[PDB]
Curated annotation (Swiss-Prot), chain A:
UniProt free text on domains: The calcium release channel activity resides in the C-terminal region while the remaining part of the protein constitutes the 'foot' structure spanning the junctional gap between the sarcoplasmic reticulum (SR) and the T-tubule. Pore opening is mediated via the cytoplasmic calcium-binding domains that mediate a small rotation of the channel-forming transmembrane regions that then leads to channel opening.
Name this protein carries in UniProt: Ryanodine receptor 1
Tissue: Detected in skeletal muscle (at protein level). Fast- or slow-twitch skeletal muscle.
Subunit field text: Homotetramer. Can also form heterotetramers with RYR2. Identified in a complex composed of RYR1, PDE4D, PKA, FKBP1A and protein phosphatase 1 (PP1). Repeated very high-level exercise decreases interaction with PDE4D and protein phosphatase 1 (PP1). Interacts with CALM; CALM with bound calcium inhibits the RYR1 channel activity. Interacts with S100A1. Interacts with FKBP1A; this stabilizes the closed conformation of the channel. Interacts with CACNA1S; interaction with CACNA1S is important for activation of the RYR1 channel. Interacts with CACNB1.
Its biological purpose: Cytosolic calcium-activated calcium channel that mediates the release of Ca(2+) from the sarcoplasmic reticulum into the cytosol and thereby plays a key role in triggering muscle contraction following depolarization of T-tubules. Repeated very high-level exercise increases the open probability of the channel and leads to Ca(2+) leaking into the cytoplasm. Can also mediate the release of Ca(2+) from intracellular stores in neurons, and may thereby promote prolonged Ca(2+) signaling in the brain. Required for normal embryonic development of muscle fibers and skeletal muscle.
UniProt-annotated binding residues for Ca(2+): E43
Length: 48, 49, 48, 221, 49
C-alpha cells in the first residue's frame, strides 16, 4: 500500500520540474516509514 | 423530506462563499452516481420517468 | 486449518457447493445471507 | 501457479445471461468497419453453431494507474485491480470506447459502447474492479475472475441490457460482471497458433486449397 | 418538488467554475458532461415554463 501511494505521488509530481517543500516532507516521512518496514522485514528473516 | 435535508447539508458542504469546492463536489458526484437511488425514482434510467 | 482452500462436492451428483447469486434488491433487504446451492459449474470463490 | 493477465495478450470479454432458465455466455463483439457499436455474440452453442470470435478478440495494450493516465493525457506488464486498461480490436485496430451517443429507449442515462479509431482521450480507457471482496485493489488480475469495468470519462459501468427482448451492451450506472478469457499470450517464432488466417499449399508452393471464384456455377460450395 | 429542486441545486453548485473550463481541466469537463447527461436541458426549460 505504501508503495502504491509513493508511486501515485511520483506520478503527481512527474510533470512538475521541482518538488516543493511540502512534498519534500511527505516524501521524507514515507521513506522513513518504508525504511522501518524494510528493517523489520529484514529482521524477521535474518538468522536465517 | 429526509432526502432534501441531506441534500441541503451537502450543498452547504460543497459550495462556500459563492464558489464550488471541487474536491468535495467531485466526491459527491461520484458517490451519488454509484448509488443512483439517491437521485430519486425519477432519473432512475431503466423504467424511469 | 486456516491455510488450505477446499471445494465441497456432493459425491454422487458431483455438484459443487456455491452461493445462489442473490438477485438485486437483496441489498435493500439488507440481508447478509446468501443461500447455498449445489451447482455443477459453481464459482471461483467457492473455496472454503 | 495461476495465470496472470498481462499486456500484449488477447482476451475476450464474456458476460452471462439467463434466458429460458438456460444460462448463456456472450462475447463482446464489434466489426469496426461500417459499424462501430458493440454487440454480443453467443458462445454457448458453439458445437452446433460456430461463433464469430475474430471480431470478439481484443488485445491489451496498456495497463496504467489513474495518475499515470492523467499525466500522459495532460502531455510486458501484469494487470492490477484499480488500473486503467486500453483495449484494441484485433481485426480493425481500433480502440474500445464509451460513446457520447445513446439510442437506448429503456435507459435515458446510458451511453452506447463502441470502437474509436484513435486511442487519444479518456473514453478509450477503462478501469477494472473486483466483483467480489475476495479480490482487493492492487491484486493481480487472474484468469476467470469476475470483473467490473468503469469508463474513465463517463464513470459508467460496462453493462448488459436485458430490458428489451434483445440483449444489448451499453454504459450504465448499473453494473455487470465480465470475465476476461485469454486467447493468446506469447508465441514462439513460426509455431502456428489457432485463430490466424493462413494458406494451405499442396506442395512446393505451387498449388493452394481454395474455392471457386465469385459468380461461379458451383455457388462457391 | 423540493427534493428534486434541492438535488438540481446541489448538482449546479457542484458544477465546475468557468476558469477551470477555460484551463481545460479534464476532471472539470468530466463533471460537467456527467451533470449534463444526468439532467437534460429540455426538462429544465419545461419546469421553468
Amino acid at each position: 500500500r505504501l508503495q502504491e501511494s509513493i508511486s501515485d505521488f511520483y506520478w503527481y509530481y512527474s510533470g512538475k520540474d521541482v518538488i516543493e517543500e511540502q512534498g519534500k516532507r511527505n516524501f521524507s516521512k514515507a521513506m522513513s516509514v518504508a525504511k522501518q518496514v524494510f528493517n523489520s522485514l529484514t529482521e524477521y528473516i535474518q538468522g536465517p | 423530506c429526509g432526502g432534501e435535508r441531506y441534500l441541503d447539508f451537502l450543498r452547504f458542504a460543497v459550495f462556500v462563499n459563492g464558489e464550488s469546492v471541487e474536491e468535495n463536489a467531485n466526491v459527491v458526484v461520484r458517490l451519488l452516481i454509484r448509488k443512483p437511488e439517491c437521485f430519486g425514482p425519477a432519473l432512475r434510467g431503466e423504467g424511469g420517468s | 486449518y486456516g491455510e488450505s482452500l477446499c471445494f465441497v462436492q456432493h459425491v454422487a451428483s458431483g455438484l459443487w457447493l456455491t452461493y445462489a447469486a442473490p438477485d438485486p434488491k437483496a441489498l435493500r433487504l439488507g440481508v447478509l445471507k446468501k443461500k447455498a446451492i449445489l451447482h455443477q459449474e459453481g464459482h471461483m470463490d467457492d473455496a472454503l | 501457479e495461476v495465470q496472470f493477465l498481462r499486456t500484449d495478450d488477447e482476451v475476450v470479454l464474456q458476460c452471462s445471461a439467463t434466458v429460458l432458465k438456460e444460462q448463456l455466455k456472450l462475447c463482446l463483439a464489434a466489426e469496426g468497419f461500417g459499424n462501430r457499436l458493440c454487440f454480443l455474440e453467443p458462445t454457448s452453442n458453439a458445437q452446433n453453431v460456430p461463433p464469430d470470435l475474430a471480431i470478439c478478440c481484443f488485445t491489451l495494450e496498456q495497463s496504467l494507474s489513474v495518475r499515470a493516465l492523467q499525466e500522459m493525457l495532460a502531455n510486458h506488464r501484469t494487470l492490477l485491480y484499480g488500473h486503467a486498461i486500453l483495449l484494441r480490436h484485433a481485426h480493425s485496430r481500433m480502440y474500445l470506447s464509451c460513446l457520447t451517443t445513446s439510442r437506448s429507449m429503456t435507459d435515458k442515462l446510458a451511453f452506447d459502447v463502441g470502437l474509436q479509431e484513435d486511442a487519444t482521450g479518456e473514453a478509450c480507457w477503462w478501469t477494472m474492479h473486483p466483483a467480489s471482496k475476495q479480490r482487493s485493489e492492487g491484486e493481480k488480475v487472474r484468469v476467470g475472475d469476475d470483473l467490473i469495468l468503469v469508463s474513465v470519462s463517463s464513470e459508467r459501468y460496462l453493462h448488459l441490457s436485458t430490458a428489451s427482448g434483445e440483449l444489448q451492451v451499453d454504459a450504465s450506472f448499473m453494473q455487470t460482471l465480465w470475465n476476461m478469457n485469454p486467447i493468446c499470450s506469447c508465441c514462439e517464432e513460426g509455431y502456428v497458433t489457432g485463430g490466424h488466417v493462413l494458406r494451405l499449399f499442396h506442395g512446393h508452393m505451387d498449388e493452394c486449397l481454395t474455392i471457386s471464384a465469385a459468380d461461379s456455377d458451383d455457388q462457391r460450395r | 418538488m423540493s427534493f428534486y429542486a434541492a438535488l438540481i441545486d446541489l448538482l449546479g453548485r457542484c458544477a465546475p467554475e468557468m476558469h477551470l473550463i477555460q484551463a481545460g481541466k479534464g476532471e472539470a469537463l468530466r463533471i460537467r458532461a456527467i451533470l449534463r447527461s444526468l439532467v437534460p436541458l429540455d426538462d429544465l426549460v419545461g419546469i421553468i415554463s
